[model samples]
Target chain A: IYETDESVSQYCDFQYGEDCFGVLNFALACATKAIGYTKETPKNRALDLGCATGRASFELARSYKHVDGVDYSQAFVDAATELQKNGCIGYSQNGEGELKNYKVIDREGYAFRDSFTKVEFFQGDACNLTPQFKEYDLIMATNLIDRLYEPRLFLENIHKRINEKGYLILTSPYTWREEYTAKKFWIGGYVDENGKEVSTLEGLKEILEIHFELVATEDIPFVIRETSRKFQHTISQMSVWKVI
Target chain B: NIYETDESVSQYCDFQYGEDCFGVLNFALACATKAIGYTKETPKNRALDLGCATGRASFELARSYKHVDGVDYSQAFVDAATELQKNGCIGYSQNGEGELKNYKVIDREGYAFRDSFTKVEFFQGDACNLTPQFKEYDLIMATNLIDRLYEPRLFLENIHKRINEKGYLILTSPYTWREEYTAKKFWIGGYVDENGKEVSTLEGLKEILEIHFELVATEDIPFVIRETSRKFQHTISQMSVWKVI
Candidate 1:
């Protein structure tokens, strides 16, 4: 079952409507500001690729008329839609080994209320996204590129789905591993032929340079509370591009 | 933990931060040094470290700048720093498994202290409401002290008057908001608003600093604080650079 209770609980903790200092809030804040910097007109459509639990998708609906949340896990789609319909959800977060704190959540946890109806969650593979999902104004792939089996395939063709002059925002820590992505298909974070340093941002610039203009790049930090004392803190570099 | 005694203050200076630069002191120094973009020709004339516990960063900046001042709220910490500057040695207690303990000593005799000794001045002062003499500095640094301030916003609202035009203001904080150190109303971040918009530390800081300084850059620096041989706390501090406008 891809929708393990433990994973769903963690996703809910991430996507929960709590208006506290959270990773999802930081990511969305950086995304909207970067999009604003692009000065793109007509924010009519947006897509949240790898829309785990659909929090960012819901937040994006405040600006976009229509938003699609696509994810590979049907369980996440089901859970997100269920929350949309019921308007409330609950989950537990591990405080310290074996101890957990349960939290109940709802749409009222966020400032933008009516936007919850503007988003629709769908189950779709990112590497091979369906043909009907073409031409969008904005697309956000928060912490998703590194987890994909074929990230290169998605990045190589993502420009075709974004309307000309629209924006494509992607954030990732670039923690590449062979388990999720084969070593041969790695985009960056390795020594080159002459033992030169190659960074993920550099790799992204090389891949998207043909059709996208890099508008902004910022480091967005997040903290995942594993326990009262333990936290997994990470900084994902967000790169915003305007498709030419 | 505030330095309540001489020994507790001395324990902080005993770390061999030069060998192990994982400590927040060295990390803050690195972030401040790299972000300031200083050179010999346009070198900073004066630098200050508010809430400068043990004064490590102040000493580090004294190497490049001519005058450096380190002010702290605790007199014990200031005395220990002065003694460290005079003798370059301090004693501390080492902890181990099962309550086993041993007396440890750290001696930095003639270690050069960034090779510009005697340029640093350590004193005790409240960072929130500093003295009138603390004016016109080329640089000021505050590391993880914002959250500990009794009134963080008050500190920010008045800090700009102390710096020269185009001077740099460097600040780093983990944003661990605690009601014990500051009142719930005085906190800058890590809270939910009435309207439900999450207020981040950076955003709160921007609200105050934008009036006097322009944000230059932001970096996430990982730091480790050791409690014992086996116990340590790891945190990533958001280091932000601001140019006095």
Candidate 2:
């Protein structure tokens, strides 16, 4: 839905530079605290999965040395890359009726961009990720689980991509629907034959508990703007896991 | 402070926050300083708390700024705030439904405004239309008062005139925009535009204030309103900080 010109504009607005801090940035802060924040021996390698518009990727690059921001959409990847090169992009925001408030997305005034690390944006799948994506110190999947066709597949194998004792941060509102994820493949949000309700957190623990240790869960709130006057504010639970 | 009916006065004045179990005043102080990136090194010369209900924010601001002013539209609230400043404690009851609450007045105990109570002043004034004398402050706070305004845009647009150059404006709101407190048109956000596009209050805020101020920081601070000992309303308000351009 965010591949088109108008939708891409909206996505960029939602991704980066909201009052000098994006929603993903706040989630990352919680993740940092969960993994034991320290200045010594910084986790310099990061993989920002589902990095729509590459805001968090760039944010991670501020502290991390090597960061890979990957997304499934080619248009989003292209926009991220173009933004990296040109430092700016013009997107229209919904102003009053048929009125378009053209916004310019840039790296300036972000406060942390001065020391931004080497970051690259790539178009890649989360479930069937590229083989080159490995040995990451941190892997962030913000609001990607419920939208994935096979979230279980990603959760089961994501541990292999992270370095030993590394961190995996997952954030999702868990608004499950059959359109984005099929009924049979859904990891949770359903009832079993015994009528036991399978929640998303329980499903996540089952898959990740084998290869990871649950560190902490924090509530992350995000606001998305659809037009000049309309906004959707939502709270997502962010689960932090340290690889066993 | 919240500009509510007479019944809501005690509920807001004694509302407790999580973790440290702070009152509305300390909560405002924590959130205000957090928004403006205050530290031990930074100097806060003056501060103003708009709609300062029970004068918690103004009393708290006195610690950091050399002088603090608490302004509210209601005389009753201003009177309560003045009494709190003088006596250090006041009795207000959470009546269970109908009968008048006859709870005894007690001291504020460990959380009283001791260090800077003398540096604070309480007065009655409208936030939408402030007096000409309320000007040149380093910090101006409007806590959870945006959605209750008749014209929030006017305050946002003209507030810079009251603040010094590079001063901070911190606004906290849950954004329960209603037709009673604010008209449909005067609202900053929470409606679909003419072209069927949804707009956010934050976006509307940026459109109005970005010209005179630069977006500095944003945070989510949670507060609890005690309707009764068992009945409480939990709310998270977004606090946005802007530096005057």
Candidate 3:
């Protein structure tokens, strides 16, 4: 669903939309939360896994010396890179069914710091990231866990990419679906055979506890505009973990 | 941790008792009690506010019923309600925007009956698998809770056993079903059936509840949850009232 041209336009607008209601921008909020959690740790380099349009990566670069934004969608990567190079991108916001308006968004107009130039965007899989995306002081996977095909693989292997005393920030609304992830691979939100509830947080603790200690948890609410009148209001649970 | 956090506790306190917007001020929970319309003929001895978030509705229900028991899944909410009941007032911070929060206090004197403080009691308990002692209520109000349950069927099917004979059961939800909260197989509605017919939540409820309950009324309750000074979630929940047969 994220590979289409419509998704690219929607994501670009979502990442940078100024007029959207609620939380101003979700990307900025996620970046702010990640940065806030790692205040005492090193701010050398940060990796944003599943960076849709790289808004958060640019935001992270404000504090981190360098930031890397990686996504599976080539179109999204192209759009992020285009914004990085030209400081602007064009997108269409749907009004009614067929009614729409094309608008150009500028990064400088939003007053993003010059540190944005320290960010880079790449098209890559989160579960199968290349070796180059390693040894980061911080790694942020905002709203990316539930959407992964094998979240366990990502959670289990993510510890190897972070430096000691580094931080791993994960946020998700936990909207799990079989289309995005197989039932067998889902981390939580299910009743186990023992008839006990297995929440997503419990699932994370089981996998990441070996390498990461849970630091803090928060519920961050966000809104996504689907049309002029249609919007999605969701609360994503943000969890911060420190390397053991 | 999400529900127990200071931010969540404060947000819910403000949402239930702080301010009003879009013509909604402590409306949903209050409206549920009014919709039931318990008269002299019907017994109003005990009311159960299941899935009660901050116990606003439970406190409201206490005005009419002899006693009200509020049950919630979050211990933080239970603690907040317990404190409010004891002290008649509680203070919380309302989020204005980034890094800006204003402290506000809400009191039972402002929103509840003066004598109803002792009439209401709160306990932390799961709605799906409630303890055996939490039964035999004259009215059971479950607001905006069905769709978020991991097993809506388990709750709906077993809820009637907890109600007294000829008792009332009120439920409200947007029916926003997602695989994250509930498995696809356990969903009450919002799915294509085996016959390729679209199944709505109301239909699913009617089918499951017909044996023990008769539908009384259905209405839409509009609510607004303020995330910040500038951001609010405007939502409409479908309220269904049923009487035990």
Candidate 4:
């Protein structure tokens, strides 16, 4: 329902405030608790989808240096890299040791370029994703399924590429189609599903059941109703987005 | 994909930044705060010059901010800058006789040349780190630094935390003038635009700043020549920025 301007998302000023910072801090801590940082060694790879401005990517790099971030907007990558060129001090930690290999990539499309030390950015459609990303271990498709041309396919693509013991974490306001169409919220995407759309929450669970072992799928309140439209929680969908 | 190298990248940068050039670089891009307009009194504006390498701009900033704090990732640069301030380089026009006068007038060694505002201290620090330890100032400047940073996002997040909501971030870059910069434009392994554009154009600067800041001012701090006599012959575009509202 918001304008599709780089200024709105990529360059939005004073938009996220405490919510953005607080959530990122919380997410980062959780990520570290879930998986402590180790050097080049990882049983899996880390991928952040719809990475937006790479705030989380930077946060992840605070503990995990082997992380790759992806976004649809080049403007976001530019800002993230610009921020990197200026320096990147991890949460509470400052200096080189904190984040030496932080990378925010935009391949323009939904294809990852390579393995661990491999990073790429390009343009692509997320729903009908390419096969190159089939190597990741940890996938974060955050706040994006609703924005894609085919969220189901996106889920499938993520399902196929996930490493055996890996996990995928996703989040959103949780959506249903007709609501978006009636409200003119184009970003929630076109339901192309024709007839009736299932309850978003129910449909997402169905998609997860199709592949993931269903580690955990619940909600963690991370939104600060700051917009003109009263605040709503940023419901997260945490799953081991992969199949063994 | 910014090209990373263990060797120093400053050789190609104009920020006069040492190893960790990214620290103050984030502060330099915030566009909300305006820079001191090259006016006369800027010699006394409140300022902080991180990595004040060789004290080029540090001395200039000293002339403005009455109480300026200049720190460096390099000890050498700080030592020299601090000495220049103590010796009254501005007051005494004579070079050698002045050098002797510095020796006779000052009890501290080398400090004989420090300027009145020359109380600068240098330390070895990685630029990627920002410390709450710094005293806030109205303006902060770092040059030729950002291109070599690793953690850009945190850099921005922290700088946003540092600046006095109204302070400025200013830095210089020759950008497209060299293959070195153009090779990695925007960290996509390409510096210049497809049209061979580099550095901060009036529009580009504005566009770039909009990402993390509110546009304030962009000016030409031309680098017509390099001390090496390499004849940089290129104009480096410099932008002054501040936090966004």
Candidate 5:
């Protein structure tokens, strides 16, 4: 579903749309907050896991010397690469049922400096990132964990990819659905065998306590416009962690 | 201080008067006017913009109604609107990337509210519990207000008393409800009933409003809210037009 042309266009519009509402852009806000929380840490490199069309990667490039944007969808990687090379991309905004308007977005509109060139795009799985993707000072996974088929695989091994004191930022609404992830594999939002409610944050602390310490947490609201008359407004929980 | 803060005032002022990507407010006002046609039977004496933030639609209402009243719960919003009404201009800051902002001045010349400014008056008041003097309006518009109210049922059930006989009421909302803003029991819709059936806001509106009003028209008005030079919120508010029975 993520590789379809319409889906790609929608993701592009979401990442690059100029007329969307909110106090902050989800992608840029994640990058900005990550930078703020890791101010004292190294700014050498950053990773944007599940980067759909690569907005956060470009934003992270402003501070990080280099940013690697990795996503599972090849179409998303292709669109991101196109934007990086040409500084522009086009998408269709749904006006109504069976109606859409074509819109072209340019990087200049976002005030991207030469630092944007410091970002690179690639197609890779977040649950099992390539070996070369290691050694990052910051790794941000925005709204990605809930959709993975096996979130534990990613959370269990993510610390191995980071530096000694590197930071990891994970953001998600934690809307776990059986379609994306199996119910048994869900990280949270369920009653345990003991009948105690287990939240996503609690699930994270249990898995990450061995190698990471929770530093900060915040609620970030985002809206995704589907059609002229419909929108999905969600607040994602952003948890900042540092390697212990 | 959610609605009365400096940042809230500035953001709403921009939302009401500043340039937009989709012209949401303008389009919504136009739709409201068209739905409540100015015929011989429909009186144009007075109109109310309830929950009016910074009063753009209130000023627009003045073009048709003899007098318009803009009422909001936020004193800061009322003050800003009154300042614009008196000074023909207001200065506000557009938020940029982080703490960066660029201050800009918007004038009546740009919005072209001329004599219409004189026709509108702003007051700070609650939508659910307005003063007795606010009754008898030919038309009342409550845009994007229902979902945010602490007691939406009270407002909906009693709103008819404020409108003139055979008058019009226009409401717009995205129905984005949260327990922080409204208690779970007071939510108009988006919940599962005791029978495990899904209840929608429209159905709830019909059940509450059918006693005093009849549905006239329903539409989806898309709006874009600018957060930064690069970030905007694109949303579609459902507009329901009702005629007083």
Candidate 6:
């Protein structure tokens, strides 16, 4: 259904997937699932760069003083706002259930707005081109780059907005704007002399190398069935967020 | 009697599974897991194993549920529960004389005392017209039974009545399409798969239950012939769980 700015919040809530975890629940699990989260330092000023329904924004509420998610979809924003007011389910190795915490405010579209809270959602543009973007400690973008206009510039926007010692984690699939035709080359736009799609590792480094150093990168092998033939199978990178 | 014939046993066993042992329990566990929408973490209050052919499923149920009971028409299968339990709770162990480490223990407790996970009994009763005595259960499991029933759904409805509001009635069979998936297989309940195939969905089961249940989870329990690498996979879903809401 084609939704209005307000309806977009619905989309946001829907995308949160039934697989949601509250900020505290996720922090502990994400840390345990990977490593490095030994002491559990709370985040005080984190942002969900494309926090459409404000899920990650909710997670940020556990440790951050202020957290918010920005999105182009309004329906998603409102639904996330509802989630903020209420609560959503939390899933882990041990179990899954709802965790009732966190609150969300709507940051109306365009750029910045008055209704800002520790957790908020907005019907807005991510590349806001303002000093307000740089005020956050963490920024997260998921399954979003394919829809980004001028993705390279978008990365720069993230870099300029990130906090002094902040980090960024961006995820995307090397997708075909169209369908995979039998005789066509899939992803050769950015290639080397040997002519291989630049390694997923090198691409992110090349994209962020100027302002941020690559501390670590890992693969998230996944298969997303958009349609029968339009399926996606690629190694997504869990790239580090850095301030230097 | 079906139990009296080798051909009847072949209708279910696929045979090569004998003694390799883990295969049958593995199959039953997969089905029970789907039926329960269960997790190693969630504790079950009480469960019953109906027609528990040797209580294999009962033992597996104990691993997850806090309390369980196994009942069967055959006394021998109930007796096997003792060997199966004596068979052991899964853990680590070292073998002394050419024995292997971490083997399943054979703790055969027959109708003696129920353990933390399960209390099993082998009794004779017809599942088709089970006496009104069976009350609410979080889960009730019956596998490979329709061939003996005269009207399958009636028996299923009886079992469904015994299931608690959120509980489930899990049944299975190796056979499919005895009557165009028409007349519920009294001995083997549920409709046959469409395209003359085995299509078991929540929608199809509603032919009996009326309300459509939310399909929660599913799994495929691989039934392989022991020792020989050559294999044929069972098309039946190992198990499928549905939420009553």
Best by the lDDT measure: 5
TM-score of chain A of 6: 0.62
> Could you arrange the candidates by TM-score from highest to lowest?
5, 3, 1, 2, 6, 4
- Could you estimate the TM-score for every candidate? 0.52, 0.49, 0.54, 0.35, 0.57, 0.39
List candidate 6 segments past 4 Å from native. A1-44, A86-117, A128-131, A173-194, A219-236, B1-245
Candidate 5: tens digits of C-alpha lDDT, residues B1-245: 59989888888877777775643555445544654463237878888898888888888888778899999999999999999889888999886532346798979766655767798989999998889999999898888899889999888999899999989888888777767788877888767777876677888899999999999888877766666543456677888888899
**Looking at model 1 chain A, which ten-residue stretch has the lowest summed lDDT?**
A17-26
In the range A45-109, model 1's lDDT, one tens digit per residue, is: 88899887887888788888888999999878877887777777777765422335677766676
Better of 1 and 5 by DockQ: 5
Q: Give the Å error, residue A90, model 4.
A: 18
DockQ of 3: 0.03
The 10-residue segment of model 1 chain B with minimum total lDDT is B15-24
Clashes within 3 Å, all models in order: 1, 11, 0, 51, 5, 36
RMSD of each: 16.0, 13.2, 12.9, 23.0, 14.2, 16.5
lDDT of candidate 1 over B1-245, digit per residue (tens): 46667545644564333234222455645754664463223458988888887777777778778898999998887876777788877666654321234566655564556476589999899989999888888888887789889999778998999988878788988777777798877888766667876677788899999999999888877665544443344566778888888
Q: Which of the CAPRI classes, incorrect, acceptable, medium or high, describes model 5?
A: incorrect
After superposing candidate 3, which stretches have Cα over 4 Å from the reference?
A1-244, B38-41
Name the lDDT value of residue A192 in candidate 4. 31
lDDT of 6: 0.47
- B150 Cα displacement, candidate 4 (Å): 50
- Give, for candidate 6 chain B, the lowest lDDT window spanning 10 residues: B92-101
Candidate 5 chain B least-lDDT 10 residues: B31-40
Candidate 5 C-alpha error for residue A239, in Å: 26
Candidate that scores best on DockQ: 5
**Chain A TM-score per candidate?**
0.91, 0.89, 0.96, 0.61, 0.96, 0.62
Give lDDT tens digits, candidate 4, residues B30-93. Answer: 2112244632233334666665554545544544456556666655445544554555331111
Off-target runs (Cα >4 Å) in candidate 1 are: A1-4, A17-24, B1-245
